Amino acid sequence: SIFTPMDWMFYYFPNYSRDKVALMARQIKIHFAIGFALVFLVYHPPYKGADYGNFHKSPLYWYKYNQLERSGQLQENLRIKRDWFYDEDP
Amino acid sequence: SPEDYPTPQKYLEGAPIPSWYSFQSNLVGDMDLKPGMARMLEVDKRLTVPTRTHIRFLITGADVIHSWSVPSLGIKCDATPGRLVKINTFIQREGVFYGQCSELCGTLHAFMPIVVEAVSPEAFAAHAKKW
Amino acid sequence: FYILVNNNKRIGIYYIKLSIIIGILGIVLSYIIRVELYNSGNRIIKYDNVNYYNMVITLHGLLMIFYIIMPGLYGGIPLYILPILSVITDIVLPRINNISIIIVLISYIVVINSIVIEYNIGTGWTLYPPLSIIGTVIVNMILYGLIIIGISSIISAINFMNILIVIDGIIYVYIWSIIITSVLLIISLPILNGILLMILSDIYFNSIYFILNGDVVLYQHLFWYFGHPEVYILILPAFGIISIILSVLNNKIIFGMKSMILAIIMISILGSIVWAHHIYTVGLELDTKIYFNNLTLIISIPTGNKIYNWIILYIGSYNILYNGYQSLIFSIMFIIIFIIGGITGIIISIDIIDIGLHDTYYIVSHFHYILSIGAVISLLAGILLLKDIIGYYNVIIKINKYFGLLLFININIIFTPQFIIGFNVMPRRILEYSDNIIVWNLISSIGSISTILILLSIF
Amino acid sequence: GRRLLHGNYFTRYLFGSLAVIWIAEYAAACQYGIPRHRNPNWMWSWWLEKQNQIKNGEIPANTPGYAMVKWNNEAEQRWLKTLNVEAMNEEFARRREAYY
Amino acid sequence: ESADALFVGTLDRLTAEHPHTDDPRFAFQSNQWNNCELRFTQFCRCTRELGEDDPRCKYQYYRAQTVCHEFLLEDWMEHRHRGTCDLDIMPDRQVIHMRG
Amino acid sequence: NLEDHFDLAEYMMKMHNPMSEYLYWIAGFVSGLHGILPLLHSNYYFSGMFLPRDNDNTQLCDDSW
Amino acid sequence: DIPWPARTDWGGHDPATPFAELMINTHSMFWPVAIFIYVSAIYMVKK
Amino acid sequence: FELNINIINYNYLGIIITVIISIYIYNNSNIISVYNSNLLLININIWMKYNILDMLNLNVLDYKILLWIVVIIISNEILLFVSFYWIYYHNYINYYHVNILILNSYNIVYNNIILLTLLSTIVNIKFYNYILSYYKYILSYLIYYNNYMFNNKIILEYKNNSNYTNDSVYMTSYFYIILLHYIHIYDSIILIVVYNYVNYKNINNYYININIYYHLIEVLYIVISILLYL
Amino acid sequence: PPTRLSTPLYSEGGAFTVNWWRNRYGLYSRRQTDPMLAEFLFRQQVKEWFYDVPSYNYAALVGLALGILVAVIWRHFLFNPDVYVRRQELRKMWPDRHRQFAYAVPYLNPQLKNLLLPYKNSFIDNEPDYADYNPVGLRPQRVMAIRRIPGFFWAIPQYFFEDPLYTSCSTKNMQTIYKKLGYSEL
Ligand SMILES: CCCCCCCCCCCCCCCCCC(=O)OC[C@H](COP(=O)([O-])OCC(O)COP(=O)([O-])OC[C@@H](COC(=O)CCCCCCCCCCCCCCCCC)OC(=O)CCCCCCCCCCCCCCCCC)OC(=O)CCCCCCCCCCCCCCCCC
Ligand code: HEA
Ligand code: HEA
Ligand SMILES: CCCCCCCC/C=C/CCCCCCCC(=O)OC[C@H](COP(=O)(O)OCCN)OC(=O)CCCCCCC/C=C/CCCCCCCC
Ligand code: CUA
Ligand SMILES: [O-][O-]
Ligand SMILES: [Cu+2]
Ligand SMILES: [K+]
Ligand SMILES: [Mg+2]
């Protein structure tokens, strides 16, 4: 069980927890497999994860995007504020 | 075959192949310091580099382990014998960035500073052409 | 007799006595360093004798780690109370216990004699080659001392492990602390011996491991494979002491005893697999760096659990009991101080932050807050708790609020400014520096002289 | 009589570990598409061509490699002064006649 | 001309057109020692085939300089001139397959 | 015997000869000297002075003393 | 560029490369977490 | 009623042994070092006598304590060899393409593996007799013959090797790993020269210790053979 | 946890169970000298260590740490172009090690590197995309992320479209400014 208070595991799943020694072994094995899987399934996979046209845009992204789009803030935010180095001295 | 040794066409047509220049950078001694020089950090030959350019620094150590550190450029690479470590940098502003060896290297570990001056690309080209 | 005694409690006293003696030499070296660093210029070391400074910093580190704090927290308090905590008559291996302390003294004499007779040069306490292998005979003498010290450490570790076979009571948390340190020694020392032998081979047998086509980074792997387990071999006994003091003085049973024990076991396993956070700037592969950075940050979890379990021990304790005893103050001060040292450790654990902060005085302040403040105070607190049992007198420490306050204030004056100069930046293992770093260096130096003066008031 | 380890622990974890190592390596090669055909030779193309010429009889047998390059180092210049491939071949021919 | 022409032909070409960039075979590691040794071996093999005066081999030396520090090259270039450089021994005088 | 019950009985019963304490402090004092004496000796060996004068390795004003 | 007197420079100072800015911000990002860890624990050091 | 333990109150061997060690450092002659080694042997033997005389206490836990110490020591021997294997493999990327002659995979490995296996069989027979409260005189002399041949073969190999320690880290690691194994072989001679039949039989820690150590050394040679010869 | 020795303890079948643990716990024990005492001590240990809720948290941490550790070791051996266990390529000069060069590019482009590099704009204020473009093709072209890294990055707005100055600090606007002065190409 991941991020689980084991007091809860003991209460709600009494039969699965009856053998506490075996329960401890599963705890180790489950988290061992999780760590192993992360390396070879999240980090290792070659030539993957480079689809930057598919950046996830969550429901909160759109709420805030539409709010600014409705007003002029989105246009103003994206506008380039300065594209010159020196001001002109009068 | 000649083609197993790839060479750009310009050089095959007689263009001069570039040479390399080496110089030694030494600490300025206490008795040789000038009124405005920074003690423990000045050197007699600085390393000039162009700004707004991607530069590859290859760092190694000949005899013992030194460490080339330039805090302003965010570089701290160990100059270890047998390892030619690649460090990439992109300077954004002109100036002179001072650093010191960061690996105990013997008696004068505290007396081999690292001075890098970043100048405009037009200035760097003129400097390199003359020096 | 004096030298022939096998009594485990007498030998424990010998370890504390010798740690204080050797400690005088350690503190003196520290005063030399801070005096020199008071301003820019030469103050007490000539520019032609800069090799002496390199030797001072090297010996300071080696002596304080292997001849003072380790003999004090792993040899002194352990040999005196462990057989009592185990409700056993005496230590399992009486004759081995005697030779261990004699070995420590003999290796100390070799080191100090090498100062007097050999040319004085230094290569750091980490003895990095090729610098260590191109030096003079003083390096050879120091190697002999370390190997001899290693013999004493391993046999003492064997001695403590045998308590499991004879313990007649319950393995208390403190006993668990020593056993795990013993395991860490049994697994780490043999690797250290091998790499030290290779340093000798290149120094004395014309070997070529640390010359071109041989990787000098190899030494750093094997050294630090022992190096970092060493820092936990030095802290874990301190943790064991803190647990006893808080429970006893607050009259509160240890909370989460099994979590305390399992936290100590966890720290050991993790501490045995994170060594390369000392080698971040060499140029290791990206995946290696990420592994070591990830596992290094994990060590905070078990270490954090112990800290919070200590806090609840002090919470809720009876108000009528006087809380100004020096042992209690030191135990509480350890929690406050260790958190500072550990948090800064997590900061340096991020490798990108480490690029800026490697070989700077920020690292110094980090391990001083844990060792020079935390470990020292823990050893003092432990001895103070056992004052009646040990029976020493002729000191004014047991109830001395002035000593605790002055020590805490002045020790922080020394090392807090060393965090600042780490972003200035002032490299480590240097004596001369730019004039714009004098202020902070001066403040720390004023702190060092003051702390020494406070050490005289105890008598 | 009470057992602590697997009844066949030594063979189990020895052969078993070897099997897992071998199988995992094949899987790794497949995922990266590594060529699995063993070549025992050097890949210097010009050299392999000179060796074929020797096998074809275009270059005389036992001719040294430094007798064929367009740049010689000092030690190979020393050797070229005493090199006589024709004499070497005659000596080998004499040995064969004596043997048969 | 083709966009992927650099990768075609050899992996060597990539750094030959972009001398100051990472070589595909060594970009995974910060340590570039092995990169220097490959580049020097390639200069050594060029001269054996084309001579020292050929512009190709002169450029193969410039490429070697891009990754090899001068103090290493000077030493390795002396060994090469004597005839003791292990990266330049003619293949038929190598001992790598002898006694094991 | 009652005298042998306590380890280091003379010290614990506060009858020990003070010389034992003096030797312990002397031993610590000698240990400290191993850091100072070689400093003075090495300074003189390579410079001719036992200790430097602050900032005597740098340029000093005319009136500096 | 160069150290200056009596400067805290907490986390670094005067970056001149994008990587240098990254280093400063990484420290600044974690610094409030460190303060939280310290304050939250120290507040409970009492009877 | 008696005390659970017969406490040892005083010991003077520790001072002597520690002084003997210092002589190795504080000396101006290598002959002094040779004779100092004899002093060490003598005093280590006295400590062993103290262990044998502790049998008079009739303490059940003494066997267990000593046995577990040996376990720890064996562990330290295994971890020292690991450090040499580590040193060897760290520079693996610079092996097999240098102009040196590495060792054959036919002659040395086979005769050595066959030899060391016979050594194990002898020790195994000694254990079997130990179990059966029996003795066979010829066994120890077979060990002496095996050790003699091993010494004869290793000496010739080193003297007839055409590559030296300064030629490459490969050669240094080869010589050092082989020497480390030999030293452990010589330590086995040191232990086995005293083998005799003792009538207290299976309460004697010597017998179990010898069996474990010999097996360790032979197993260590299997690892070396795979790394270097094969 | 039963308090009477008469009441049996439930055990699963397998290699890590209550029965498996009982068989091996007292192998080296001098204190378990009879059935009654042996069972009492066995249940005492089981109650103390396996019925302790917080102890299971450490079991999770050791498994996770060890799993990562075993996998990083294995990955180096199996995929890292610079780790050699076979010798064929080590018996050849560097230019001829084609089979080992095949590991190079696949190993240079792990998934997490492609997934997390776009999030450099949460650590860099000026020109966070200074190194995005590379004409060679050994690595993918990089596109800056649209959101801040989840967690402790409160100093930057949750989404970069919210930030007013983000677009004006891009390497593209900076290049425009400097190219207008003739100062530099990039
Ligand atoms: C970090 C520092 C601050 C720490 C603060 C915090 C502390 C917290 C508390 C810690 C408490 C820890 C636990 C304590 C437990 C105490 C148990 C105890 O008392 O055990 C009983 C034990 C022994 O009592 P006992 O049972 O009556 O023993 C009777 C004897 O066995 C038998 O009696 P006997 O009279 O027959 O004794 C024999 C006696 C016979 O003695 C005599 O006949 C002595 C004659 C007078 C000699 C006086 C010295 C002369 C020196 C001359 C120098 C000349 C230099 C000239 C230079 C010229 C230059 C031009 O001695 C000998 O024969 C051998 C002596 C060997 C040891 C002394 C070595 C001295 C240094 C040598 C250096 C050599 C370097 C050579 C280099 C060569 C290079 C080539 O007590 C001691 O040994 C004394 C302990 C005293 C301190 C206890 C702790 C108190 C609390 C701490 C205070 C602060 C200390 C700070 C450190 C020191 C700072 C300097
Ligand atoms: C006993 C001494 C001791 C102790 C305990 C530690 C503990 C730690 N050290 Fe260590 N360290 C040294 C002694 C010590 N160190 C020495 C002597 C050196 C220099 C050697 C040399 O280079 O010569 C060094 C160097 C050193 C470096 C090298 C920096 C550099 O070389 O530039 C690093 C970086 O990874 C590091 C990290 C850590 C970490 C991450 C911990 C962790 O153990 C800290 C864990 C503790 C905490 C994290 C605080 C308590 C926990 C909580 C409050 C829970 C909540 C906190 C979080 C969730 C983060 N240490
Ligand atoms: C635990 C080990 C330990 C201890 C206690 C100390 C204590 C001190 N150290 Fe430490 N120091 C190191 C270990 C230690 N140090 C190491 C390992 C290095 C790096 C070495 C290297 O760079 O190569 C180092 C480096 C180091 C330097 C860096 C010099 C350099 O390399 O440039 C400096 C000065 O700035 C310094 C100063 C001090 C000071 C002023 C004290 C203290 O004086 C502060 C005041 C505290 C006290 C005076 C109390 C101490 C008392 C005891 C230790 C005795 C305890 C005994 C009992 C309780 C029985 N130390
Ligand atoms: C007993 C019968 C006889 C058996 C005889 C065996 C003789 C040979 C034994 C050699 C040592 C054991 C490994 C054998 C490997 C065989 C397959 C092989 O060649 O593998 C090669 C392959 C890589 O080869 P290259 O192509 O050169 O590199 C490409 C870029 N990386 O290497 C391996 O896989 C072998 C080396 C690693 C072995 C161990 C597995 C790796 C992970 C170790 C994890 C350690 C941590 C703890 C794990 C605990 C359990 C999960
Ligand atoms: Cu060079 Cu320090
Ligand atoms: O060292 O942490
Ligand atoms: Cu560490
Ligand atoms: K100074
Ligand atoms: Mg460093």
Short mmCIF file of N, CA and C in Angstrom, two decimals, chain C residues 92-129:
data_model
loop_
_atom_site.label_atom_id
_atom_site.label_comp_id
_atom_site.label_asym_id
_atom_site.label_seq_id
_atom_site.Cartn_x
_atom_site.Cartn_y
_atom_site.Cartn_z
N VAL C 92 32.74 -8.51 26.02
CA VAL C 92 32.96 -9.88 25.59
C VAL C 92 34.44 -10.18 25.40
N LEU C 93 35.20 -9.28 24.81
CA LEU C 93 36.61 -9.50 24.49
C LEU C 93 37.52 -8.59 25.32
N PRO C 94 37.90 -9.03 26.53
CA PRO C 94 38.66 -8.13 27.42
C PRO C 94 40.03 -7.73 26.87
N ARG C 95 40.81 -8.69 26.38
CA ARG C 95 42.17 -8.38 25.94
C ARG C 95 42.17 -7.51 24.69
N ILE C 96 41.21 -7.73 23.79
CA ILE C 96 41.12 -6.90 22.59
C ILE C 96 40.81 -5.46 22.96
N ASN C 97 39.97 -5.27 23.98
CA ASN C 97 39.63 -3.92 24.40
C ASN C 97 40.86 -3.16 24.86
N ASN C 98 41.76 -3.83 25.58
CA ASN C 98 42.97 -3.18 26.06
C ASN C 98 43.85 -2.74 24.90
N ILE C 99 44.08 -3.62 23.93
CA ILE C 99 45.02 -3.30 22.86
C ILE C 99 44.48 -2.18 21.99
N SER C 100 43.15 -2.04 21.89
CA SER C 100 42.58 -1.04 21.01
C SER C 100 42.97 0.37 21.44
N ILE C 101 42.88 0.66 22.74
CA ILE C 101 43.23 1.99 23.21
C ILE C 101 44.73 2.22 23.08
N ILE C 102 45.53 1.20 23.34
CA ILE C 102 46.98 1.33 23.19
C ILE C 102 47.33 1.63 21.74
N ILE C 103 46.64 0.97 20.81
CA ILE C 103 46.88 1.20 19.39
C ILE C 103 46.59 2.65 19.03
N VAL C 104 45.49 3.20 19.55
CA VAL C 104 45.13 4.58 19.24
C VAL C 104 46.24 5.52 19.70
N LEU C 105 46.74 5.31 20.92
CA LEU C 105 47.80 6.18 21.43
C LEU C 105 49.06 6.06 20.59
N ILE C 106 49.42 4.85 20.18
CA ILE C 106 50.65 4.66 19.42
C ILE C 106 50.54 5.32 18.06
N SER C 107 49.37 5.25 17.43
CA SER C 107 49.20 5.92 16.15
C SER C 107 49.23 7.44 16.31
N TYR C 108 48.73 7.95 17.44
CA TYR C 108 48.81 9.38 17.69
C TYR C 108 50.26 9.84 17.82
N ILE C 109 51.08 9.07 18.54
CA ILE C 109 52.48 9.44 18.73
C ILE C 109 53.20 9.46 17.39
N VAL C 110 52.89 8.50 16.52
CA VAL C 110 53.51 8.47 15.20
C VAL C 110 53.18 9.74 14.43
N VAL C 111 51.92 10.17 14.48
CA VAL C 111 51.50 11.34 13.71
C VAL C 111 52.23 12.58 14.20
N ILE C 112 52.21 12.82 15.51
CA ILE C 112 52.79 14.04 16.04
C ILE C 112 54.31 14.03 15.87
N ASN C 113 54.93 12.86 16.03
CA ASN C 113 56.36 12.75 15.77
C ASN C 113 56.67 13.13 14.33
N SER C 114 55.79 12.77 13.40
CA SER C 114 56.02 13.10 12.00
C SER C 114 55.95 14.61 11.77
N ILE C 115 55.17 15.33 12.58
CA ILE C 115 55.19 16.78 12.51
C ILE C 115 56.59 17.29 12.83
N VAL C 116 57.17 16.77 13.91
CA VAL C 116 58.41 17.32 14.44
C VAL C 116 59.58 17.00 13.52
N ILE C 117 59.63 15.78 12.99
CA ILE C 117 60.82 15.29 12.31
C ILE C 117 60.74 15.47 10.80
N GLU C 118 59.58 15.26 10.20
CA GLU C 118 59.46 15.32 8.75
C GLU C 118 59.22 16.75 8.28
N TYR C 119 59.50 16.98 7.00
CA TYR C 119 59.10 18.23 6.38
C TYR C 119 57.58 18.36 6.42
N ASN C 120 57.11 19.57 6.69
CA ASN C 120 55.68 19.82 6.91
C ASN C 120 55.03 20.23 5.60
N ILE C 121 54.25 19.32 5.01
CA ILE C 121 53.44 19.60 3.84
C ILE C 121 52.07 18.96 4.06
N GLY C 122 51.10 19.40 3.27
CA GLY C 122 49.73 18.95 3.45
C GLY C 122 49.06 18.66 2.13
N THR C 123 48.08 17.75 2.19
CA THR C 123 47.29 17.38 1.01
C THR C 123 45.81 17.23 1.36
N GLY C 124 45.36 17.85 2.44
CA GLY C 124 44.01 17.67 2.92
C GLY C 124 43.84 16.37 3.69
N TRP C 125 42.77 16.31 4.48
CA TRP C 125 42.47 15.08 5.19
C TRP C 125 41.89 14.02 4.27
N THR C 126 41.52 14.40 3.05
CA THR C 126 40.99 13.49 2.05
C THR C 126 42.08 12.91 1.15
N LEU C 127 43.33 13.30 1.36
CA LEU C 127 44.50 12.69 0.73
C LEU C 127 44.27 12.34 -0.74
N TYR C 128 43.75 13.30 -1.48
CA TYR C 128 43.54 13.09 -2.91
C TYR C 128 44.88 12.88 -3.61
N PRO C 129 45.03 11.83 -4.41
CA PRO C 129 46.13 11.77 -5.36
C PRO C 129 45.80 12.61 -6.58
#
